[PDB]
Amino acid sequence: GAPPIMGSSVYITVELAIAVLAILGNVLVCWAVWLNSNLQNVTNYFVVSLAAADILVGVLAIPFAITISTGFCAACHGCLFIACFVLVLAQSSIFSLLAIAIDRYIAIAIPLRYNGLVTGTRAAGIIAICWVLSFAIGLTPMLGWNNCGQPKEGKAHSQGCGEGQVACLFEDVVPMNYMVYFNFFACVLVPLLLMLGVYLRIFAAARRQLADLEDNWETLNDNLKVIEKADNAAQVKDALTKMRAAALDAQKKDFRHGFDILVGQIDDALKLANEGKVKEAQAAAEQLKTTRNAYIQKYLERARSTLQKEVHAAKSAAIIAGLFALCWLPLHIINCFTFFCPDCSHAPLWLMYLAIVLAHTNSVVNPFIYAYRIREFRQTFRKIIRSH
Ligand SMILES: Nc1nc(NCCCN2CCN(c3ccccc3)CC2)nc2nc(-c3ccco3)nn12
Numbered sequence: 505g506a507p508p509i510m511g512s513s514v515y516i517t518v519e520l521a522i523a524v525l526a527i528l529g530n531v532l533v534c535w536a537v538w539l540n541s542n543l544q545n546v547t548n549y550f551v552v553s554l555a556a557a558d559i560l561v562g563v564l565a566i567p568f569a570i571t572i573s574t575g576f577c578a579a580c581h582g583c584l585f586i587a588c589f590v591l592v593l594a595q596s597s598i599f600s601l602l603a604i605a606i607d608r609y610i611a612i613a614i615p616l617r618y619n620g621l622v623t624g625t626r627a628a629g630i631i632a633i634c635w636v637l638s639f640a641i642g643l644t645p646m647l648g649w650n651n652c653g654q655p656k657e658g659k660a661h662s663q664g665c666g667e668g669q670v671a672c673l674f675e676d677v678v679p680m681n682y683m684v685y686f687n688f689f690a691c692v693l694v695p696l697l698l699m700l701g702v703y704l705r706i707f708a709a710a711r712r713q714l715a716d717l718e719d720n721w722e723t724l725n726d727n728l729k730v731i732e733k734a735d736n737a738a739q740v741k742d743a744l745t746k747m748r749a750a751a752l753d754a755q756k757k758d759f760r761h762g763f764d765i766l767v768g769q770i771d772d773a774l775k776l777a778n779e780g781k782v783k784e785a786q787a788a789a790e791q792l793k794t795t796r797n798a799y800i801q802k803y804l805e806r807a808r809s810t811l812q813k814e815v816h817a818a819k820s821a822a823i824i825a826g827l828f829a830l831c832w833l834p835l836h837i838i839n840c841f842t843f844f845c846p847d848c849s850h851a852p853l854w855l856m857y858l859a860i861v862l863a864h865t866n867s868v869v870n871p872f873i874y875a876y877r878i879r880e881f882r883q884t885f886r887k888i889i890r891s892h
Pocket residue numbers: 590591594673674675683835836839850851852853856857860
């Protein structure tokens with residue numbers, strides 16, 4: 505039985521190193537959004553709320569974690585607060601991650617009404633509501649779902665605790681059924697599975713919209729060939745009607761002028777076709793190639809470029825949500841083994857604190873993901889660092 509202070513010193517030192525990195529990195533995130541108006545959108549307001557939660561992990565949750573690892577004597581309800589405040593920050597992170605995913609689905613599924621529906625004022629109201637709900641969820645043990653009514657009196661007496669005090673240990677005061685059923689299953693696992701469903705819908709919507717862009721482009725060029733090798737006016741008419749319906753379908757200033765020319769030129773050739781002038785209709789339809797090269801192809805390439813940037817931005821946000829799951833799941837899974845298998849030996853002490861440190865490391869990783877995957881953040885980070 506090596507002296508407890510030795511293994512404790514390693515744990516505390518690692519925790520302090522994580523606290524400094526979580527504060528520095530996420531302060532840089534908040535500083536960047538404050539300074540750059542190009543980073544000031546609804547999506548990044550939830551990013552800032554997520555960074556504030558990670559800042560508080562280093563300022564409060566990690567000092568709280570170091571304190572409870574000592575098992576110090578404390579009034580049980582004060583011990584409860586130290587033990588549960590990290591659950592508030594974790595729940596806030598979940599709400600921010602879910603809001604980011606929903607925000608990106610709205611942008612890709614209904615971009616015409618995104619700016620009218622998703623505003624900064626409504627976003628700030630959602631952020632406040634989610635923080636209130638995070639305190640209620642994370643501090644639910646302080647409402648009565650705790651073990652303070654059944655204190656470990658032998659442990660308190662051996663540590664010399666005073667009357668009404670307990671040895672402040674996490675699994676002594678926080679019920680494991682709350683941690684597994686309420687916190688993990690209901691409040692962590694279900695929202696993460698919802699985020700998964702949202703991102704699946706995002707990428708499915710992106711793939712469908714890109715295919716529709718390419719299908720209208722192919723339909724335009726195929727029907728042009730049909731008109732060129734038609735032998736009667738009725739065949740030219742058939743191809744032109746399909747081109748006109750697709751042109752209006754692809755339309756839903758230089759963008760508008762290009763489609764205004766295209767639809768008008770289609771109506772010109774259609775009128776010649778209805779008069780039975782095949783050669784004259786085919787020559788009029790040949791003018792469409794000038795409009796296609798000068799206007800339509802540029803919109804196709806820009807619409808494609810915008811969708812691919814939305815896919816890339818959604819992938820970056822999904823990586824953030826996935827890294828949250830990877831960092832928090834081991835600790836939750838260990839609680840499941842403790843709760844569901846009382847015949848299994850408890851996970852060893854070194855593995856408990858490895859899982860605790862790993863969960864805390866999640867508060868360090870998000871600034872690196874933004875810096876490596878988002879150019880606007882990376883450039884703003886460099887300006888802040890260089891100029892300071
Ligand atoms: N489960 C849990 N524990 C702690 N801290 C106490 C660890 C040391 N114990 C010391 C006494 N035991 C022990 C006894 C013999 C051998 C090994 C261990 C249990 C662990 N902190 C937490 N945080 C979240 C958590 C937060 C969010 C999701 O899960 N679970 N958790």
